Amino acid sequence: EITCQENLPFTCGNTDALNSSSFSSDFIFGVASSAYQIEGTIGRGLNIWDGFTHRYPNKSGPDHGNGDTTCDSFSYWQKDIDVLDELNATGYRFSIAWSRIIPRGKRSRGVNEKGIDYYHGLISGLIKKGITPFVTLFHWDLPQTLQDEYEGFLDPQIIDDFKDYADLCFEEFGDSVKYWLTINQLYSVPTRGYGSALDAPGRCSPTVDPSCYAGNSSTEPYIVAHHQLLAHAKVVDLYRKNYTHQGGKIGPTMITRWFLPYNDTDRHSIAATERMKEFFLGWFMGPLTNGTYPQIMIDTVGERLPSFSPEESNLVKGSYDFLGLNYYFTQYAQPSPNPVNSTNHTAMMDAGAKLTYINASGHYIGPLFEKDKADSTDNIYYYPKGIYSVMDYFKNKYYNPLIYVTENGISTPGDENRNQSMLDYTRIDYLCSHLCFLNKVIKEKDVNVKGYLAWALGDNYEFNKGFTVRFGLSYIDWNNVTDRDLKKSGQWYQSFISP
Amino acid sequence: EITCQENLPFTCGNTDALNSSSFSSDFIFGVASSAYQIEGTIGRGLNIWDGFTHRYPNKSGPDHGNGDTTCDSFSYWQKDIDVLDELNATGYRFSIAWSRIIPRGKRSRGVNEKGIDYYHGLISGLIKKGITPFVTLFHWDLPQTLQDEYEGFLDPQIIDDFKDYADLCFEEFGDSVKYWLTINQLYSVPTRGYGSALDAPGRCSPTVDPSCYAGNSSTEPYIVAHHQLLAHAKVVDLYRKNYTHQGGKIGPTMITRWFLPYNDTDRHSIAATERMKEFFLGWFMGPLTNGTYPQIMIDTVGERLPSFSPEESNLVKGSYDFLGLNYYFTQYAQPSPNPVNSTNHTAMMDAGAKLTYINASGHYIGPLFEKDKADSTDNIYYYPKGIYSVMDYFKNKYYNPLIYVTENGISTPGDENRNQSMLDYTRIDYLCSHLCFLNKVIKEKDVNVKGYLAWALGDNYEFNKGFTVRFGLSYIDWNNVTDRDLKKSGQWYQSFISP
Numbered sequence: 002e003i004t005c006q007e008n009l010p011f012t013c014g015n016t017d018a019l020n021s022s023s024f025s026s027d028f029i030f031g032v033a034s035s036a037y038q039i040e041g042t043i044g045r046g047l048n049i050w051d052g053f054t055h056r057y058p059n060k061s062g063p064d065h066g067n068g069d070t071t072c073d074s075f076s077y078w079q080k081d082i083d084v085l086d087e088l089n090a091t092g093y094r095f096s097i098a099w100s101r102i103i104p105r106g107k108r109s110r111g112v113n114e115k116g117i118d119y120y121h122g123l124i125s126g127l128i129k130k131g132i133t134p135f136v137t138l139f140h141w142d143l144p145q146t147l148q149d150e151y152e153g154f155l156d157p158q159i160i161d162d163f164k165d166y167a168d169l170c171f172e173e174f175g176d177s178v179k180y181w182l183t184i185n186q187l188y189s190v191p192t193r194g195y196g197s198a199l200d201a202p203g204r205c206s207p208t209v210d211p212s213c214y215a216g217n218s219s220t221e222p223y224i225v226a227h228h229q230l231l232a233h234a235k236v237v238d239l240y241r242k243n244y245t246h247q248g249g250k251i252g253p254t255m256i257t258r259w260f261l262p263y264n265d266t267d268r269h270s271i272a273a274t275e276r277m278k279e280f281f282l283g284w285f286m287g288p289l290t291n292g293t294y295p296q297i298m299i300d301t302v303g304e305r306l307p308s309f310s311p312e313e314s315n316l317v318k319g320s321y322d323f324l325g326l327n328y329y330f331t332q333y334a335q336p337s338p339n340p341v342n343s344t345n346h347t348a349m350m351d352a353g354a355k356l357t358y359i360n361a362s363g364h365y366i367g368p369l370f371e372k373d374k375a376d377s378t379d380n381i382y383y384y385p386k387g388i389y390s391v392m393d394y395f396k397n398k399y400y401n402p403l404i405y406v407t408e409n410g411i412s413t414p415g416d417e418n419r420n421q422s423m424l425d426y427t428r429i430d431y432l433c434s435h436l437c438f439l440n441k442v443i444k445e446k447d448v449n450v451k452g453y454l455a456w457a458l459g460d461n462y463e464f465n466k467g468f469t470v471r472f473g474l475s476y477i478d479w480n481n482v483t484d485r486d487l488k489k490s491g492q493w494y495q496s497f498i499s500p
Numbered sequence: 501e502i503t504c505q506e507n508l509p510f511t512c513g514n515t516d517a518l519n520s521s522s523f524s525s526d527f528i529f530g531v532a533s534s535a536y537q538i539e540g541t542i543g544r545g546l547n548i549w550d551g552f553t554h555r556y557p558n559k560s561g562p563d564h565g566n567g568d569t570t571c572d573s574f575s576y577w578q579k580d581i582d583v584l585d586e587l588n589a590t591g592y593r594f595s596i597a598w599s600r601i602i603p604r605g606k607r608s609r610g611v612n613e614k615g616i617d618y619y620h621g622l623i624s625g626l627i628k629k630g631i632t633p634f635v636t637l638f639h640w641d642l643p644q645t646l647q648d649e650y651e652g653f654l655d656p657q658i659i660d661d662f663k664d665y666a667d668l669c670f671e672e673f674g675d676s677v678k679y680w681l682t683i684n685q686l687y688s689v690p691t692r693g694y695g696s697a698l699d700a701p702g703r704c705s706p707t708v709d710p711s712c713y714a715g716n717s718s719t720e721p722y723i724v725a726h727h728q729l730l731a732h733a734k735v736v737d738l739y740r741k742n743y744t745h746q747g748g749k750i751g752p753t754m755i756t757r758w759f760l761p762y763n764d765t766d767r768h769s770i771a772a773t774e775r776m777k778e779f780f781l782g783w784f785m786g787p788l789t790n791g792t793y794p795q796i797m798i799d800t801v802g803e804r805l806p807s808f809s810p811e812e813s814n815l816v817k818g819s820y821d822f823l824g825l826n827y828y829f830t831q832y833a834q835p836s837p838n839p840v841n842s843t844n845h846t847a848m849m850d851a852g853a854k855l856t857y858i859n860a861s862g863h864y865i866g867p868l869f870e871k872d873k874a875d876s877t878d879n880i881y882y883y884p885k886g887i888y889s890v891m892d893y894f895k896n897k898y899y900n901p902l903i904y905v906t907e908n909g910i911s912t913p914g915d916e917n918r919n920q921s922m923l924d925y926t927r928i929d930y931l932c933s934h935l936c937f938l939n940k941v942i943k944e945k946d947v948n949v950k951g952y953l954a955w956a957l958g959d960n961y962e963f964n965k966g967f968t969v970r971f972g973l974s975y976i977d978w979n980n981v982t983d984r985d986l987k988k989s990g991q992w993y994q995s996f997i998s999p
């Protein structure tokens with residue numbers, strides 16, 4: 002019988018009690034990254050994260066930081082492999098920058114052979130060290146040209162451009178890459194990129210944020226989400242029809258959260274919690290498992306929710322061999338109005354829920370996850386059992402999928418000095434508390450989870466936050482980025498992997 | 501009788517002997533800038549100077565500097581107006597960033613009203629201080645989308661996109677702007693952007709520079725130059741047919757240089773010198789005055805030189821109300837082979853000339869203009885009489901045009917500290933020596949020159965050099981860019997203007 006802690010102090014950092022041998026022999030352990038965040042612009046075209054951070058610097062991060070040079074994994078990819086080798090990691094999730102291999106967006110305009118060579122070397126070096134690649138085709142860094150030609154995922158033109166890009170990746174790298182992820186966190190671009198405009202490309206309704214260059218927060222999230230599903234599905238069908246000889250697997254990445262009622266004896270809060278599951282997870286998992294959006298979304302969103310034709314439904318339903326599930330935290334849900342006629346209406350209001358980390362009786366759900374110094378009542382708190390709840394829910398509700406945990410991790414503040422940042426015991430407690438629950442759900446619920454990739458391999462540019470927070474298991478000095486030095490968490494993870 | 505100095509020491513910094521009253525009463529005096537170099541990316545889309553400096557950082561400058569923030573004239577445009585007001589300047593040349601007003605390149609994709617507002621405020625503030633704007637529509641900063649859709653000026657699609665952009669500028673700002681420049685230095689994009697790949701977009705033949713993403717240095721300069729002439733001419737015809745009510749004037753900007761024989765008793769060097777005039781100046785001035793390229797270019801370049809149809813010839817011939825002539829220096833020319841079959845052949849080799857600053861008897865042409873610490877035999881030297889020679893030549897060869905000197909200036913090294921940089925006596929000597937010759941040619945040759953705009957208003961990002969050199973008449977601290985403090989040269993220029 003496995004017992005896991007939900008509250009500080011944690012004791013799961015003792016590798017005598019929790020280690021890789023606690024999991025099945027074949028279980029993959031590693032770390033994750035993405036291309037905007039780590040490579041730098043050298044050698045690639047420009048994408049919408051370049052565009053957004055440069056046009057709206059105060060949205061790039063409080064320090065106005067961006068991915069121009071970052072940790073320079075363009076030059077120092079071997080040092081990333083060395084970190085993985087030091088960890089004895091068996092997996093590494095990274096992304097391919099579309100703008101590095103097809104700087105002009107549309108594949109007929111030519112490829113960047115040097116870009117292709119950069120990923121070939123990375124992939125070869127990973128394999129030579131026994132590290133299985135998990136490659137994300139699209140971690141948000143859309144070539145700027147596509148955004149400017151047709152507003153990217155807002156237009157159905159994205160489908161074929163994304164398919165031709167994907168096809169080039171499978172042709173060039175699929176002999177060695179056997180695990181592909183299509184779009185990172187399907188929920189995030191529609192809502193943050195086209196709803197709140199916190200993320201690239203930064204579109205929204207005028208009264209949501211007057212800085213947005215265009216948009217409609219009420220309708221565009223749905224359009225973009227629908228196009229993401231179609232583009233994803235077209236790529237999975239291409240992979241499974243044209244690249245079955247490579248013997249690999251493909252899936253989407255979901256951001257997952259658990260949801261609990263803000264008041265667990267209040268029917269209205271319970272109903273909001275179930276609505277959040279459908280609006281946050283079912284918005285994509287209903288299409289992916291059934292070819293349709295959830296009924297509550299059909300009902301509430303009405304004419305703003307696109308329909309799938311019968312062909313599209315069939316393309317999307319079942320369009321995965323596995324699911325990459327990212328997991329960081331859980332929210333309490335309570336009812337909230339949905340003012341659909343308000344000029345500041347967003348798609349995120351359609352769920353009819355307000356989300357918090359404190360419940361009605363004043364209980365904070367778990368330890369601190371992210372401090373927000375400008376408004377401390379907006380602090381995020383984590384909830385280790387949420388990983389158990391999410392995996393259980395996916396098995397039960399979503400037809401027993403094969404799952405890889407493709408991100409899990411926690412930041413520490415960029416204001417800490419190097420010594421403080423290296424002594425990242427808060428990160429060991431976060432990681433180990435989640436791994437304990439992950440082992441527990443695999444054993445108790447028989448969830449088909451086959452690997453875990455912690456966020457992040459190293460310190461990097463953090464979307465929305467610049468370099469004001471650090472997520473790495475290895476530390477990078479921004480005044481001299483060559484080295485990636487294992488923190489206390491990296492050193493702990495090394496011992497967890499090889500106890 | 502006017503006597504002007506050609507060699508150090510100069511004495512023309514004494515405003516008792518040379519000042520604005522030496523020139524006609526109506527003569528315009530001011531300074532110049534360009535939008536990439538001064539504004540920053542905030543509030544605009546991305547262009548090919550963003551793309552080039554980010555993809556090829558070692559070509560942006562030795563410091564890898566770029567125009568991301570620069571002197572932040574987006575925020576501090578009023579401080580630029582204050583500099584001009586302090587100078588009592590009567591003119592200011594600046595450029596409009598296409599990517600600020602039409603971030604998506606093609607006007608039908610929408611305009612950026614806030615971008616438009618930024619130039620309206622600038623223009624209104626200039627006029628309120630009695631400063632005549634001279635506005636460059638295109639100072640090299642092509643929206644990246646156009647480069648990625650069709651390779652920008654490489655394709656004839658540029659013509660209409662540039663025309664629709666220009667039309668928006670005339671509609672929005674032409675009620676107040678009465679002097680328009682179309683393309684900055686017609687020679688430079690074809691040769692540096694598409695020949696040597698020193699400049700955006702960075703195309704060349706593979707053996708010229710293996711880093712180029714595509715190109716052909718032998719043919720693409722000609723294609724691009726031809727499209728520039730067509731696009732320029734289409735915009736001048738639009739201005740003169742549709743905006744004649746505004747009562748303004750439009751012209752191209754030429755980079756001018758004088759050329760002298762490396763050996764003035766050697767027929768071969770004399771012939772090379774005359775070939776350089778045709779290949780450097782006549783490449784554009786033959787079309788602009790006659791609708792045809794020079795005969796020597798027709799003969800030498802052969803099938804690589806595009807033809808104008810009769811309609812195009814007529815559009816281009818006479819497509820100026822004035823000429824903006826930039827002038828910085830003069831070269832000696834000697835013969836050089838033109839290996840047209842060599843894989844590393846460039847269009848610049850077609851003139852059959854090698855250019856130096858030292859003649860056959862060892863004479864350096866004038867004072868130091870730019871030191872090149874990596875190869876000192878590549879140092880540039882200036883030649884004050886060259887401004888006289890150029891203006892005389894334009895009057896005699898090119899049908900007595902109306903001329904504004906739209907750039908003239910000199911750098912000082914970025915390694916100097918602030919005190920040294922403020923004590924920029926070398927810049928006073930450069931400026932005054934040229935102004936003396938400019939007054940002399942107006943008086944002696946009756947050249948129709950009506951104003952002079954020194955490069956630059958302030959320190960800025962220098963194409964190819966980052967922040968490793970300074971050109972300003974006012975100093976900017978890169979650790980805190982708000983202020984623009986007049987240097988010794990700005991203070992001298994103030995007294996020259998108002999003696």
Ligand SMILES: *[C@@H]1O[C@H](CO)[C@@H](O)[C@H](O)[C@H]1NC(C)=O
Nearest residue numbers: 056057058059060211212543
């Ligand atoms: C941040 O920048 C935008 C311009 O993109 C401006 O509209 C907004 O007010 C600024 N935000 C703050 C908090 O100052």
Ligand SMILES: *[C@@H]1O[C@H](CO)[C@@H](O)[C@H](O)[C@H]1NC(C)=O
Nearest residue numbers: 208209340343344345346347
């Ligand atoms: C607009 O929404 C903001 C946050 O969504 C809210 O504080 C404000 O009341 C809303 N305004 C109206 C008119 O509903």
Ligand SMILES: *[C@@H]1O[C@H](CO)[C@@H](O)[C@H](O)[C@H]1NC(C)=O
Nearest residue numbers: 478480481482483484485486
């Ligand atoms: C930068 O870091 C690398 C790795 O530690 C080191 O070898 C190199 O000397 C350092 N550079 C400077 C300038 O300190």
Ligand SMILES: *[C@@H]1O[C@H](CO)[C@@H](O)[C@H](O)[C@H]1NC(C)=O
Nearest residue numbers: 044555556557558559710711
């Ligand atoms: C500069 O960068 C390019 C890659 O864009 C590389 O090909 C070239 O060798 C580097 N130049 C030098 C002098 O190192």
Ligand SMILES: *[C@@H]1O[C@H](CO)[C@@H](O)[C@H](O)[C@H]1NC(C)=O
Nearest residue numbers: 707708839842843844845846
């Ligand atoms: C290529 O040109 C470079 C400079 O233009 C020159 O030094 C070299 O000789 C040329 N090579 C050939 C094969 O002509």
Ligand SMILES: *[C@@H]1O[C@H](CO)[C@@H](O)[C@H](O)[C@H]1NC(C)=O
Nearest residue numbers: 977979980981982983984985
């Ligand atoms: C920056 O320069 C401006 C102008 O001199 C000054 O007012 C402001 O205090 C300076 N900022 C800092 C942080 O020094």
Ligand SMILES: OC[C@H]1N/C(=N\O)[C@H](O)[C@@H](O)[C@@H]1O
Nearest residue numbers: 035185256327329456463464
């Ligand atoms: O916020 C941490 C990490 N979290 C993420 N999702 O939750 C992103 O996919 C990744 O790019 C980001 O850096």
Ligand SMILES: OC[C@H]1N/C(=N\O)[C@H](O)[C@@H](O)[C@@H]1O
Nearest residue numbers: 534684755826828955962963
């Ligand atoms: O090199 C000085 C100056 N010289 C220029 N031409 O000669 C450019 O138009 C301008 O952008 C550049 O900064």
Ligand SMILES: [Zn+2]
Nearest residue numbers: 055069554568
């Ligand atoms: Zn940048």
